[PDB]
Design a protein around this ligand. Sequence first.
Ligand SMILES: [Zn+2]
Ligand SMILES: [Zn+2]
Lengths: 114, 48
Amino acid sequence: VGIRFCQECNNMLYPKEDKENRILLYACRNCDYQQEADNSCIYVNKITHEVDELTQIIADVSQDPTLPRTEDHPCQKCGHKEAVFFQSHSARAEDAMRLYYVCTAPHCGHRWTE
Amino acid sequence: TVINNWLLIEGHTIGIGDSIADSKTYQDIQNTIKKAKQDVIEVIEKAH
Ligand SMILES: [Zn+2]
Ligand SMILES: [Zn+2]
């Protein structure tokens, strides 16, 4: 879940409880715009942070000449031999040495983890 | 006094030949270093 904005003054929506119909809604306190919430969640907190970093790493990192690269691990979709590998950057996890792999060819941006 | 004056006879020194070892010892040392480096490579591969 994430932020949404009132469509007239483009300011924050924040949640309120309707007391009569007993339903949650979003109201921007700078105006009277009330919009019914569709997510029943207002706040989530991934305390253990077990999110895999594949979304944080970009495919453009394949052009770095100082990164190491091996022919051992092939890409899944195309099977180009060359794939640059590098370590995690999450500070706070149960592990700290796993290798993230990025396929090396110009158009195949495939990123995977073994 | 007496042992300095005796050391005048035998003498003492240090040189390159005191720091050069045997050719077999050099090979043993190189083999040990290569084995250690291979073991560290294996440990790195285990963590990888
Ligand atoms: Zn508003
Ligand atoms: Zn690929």
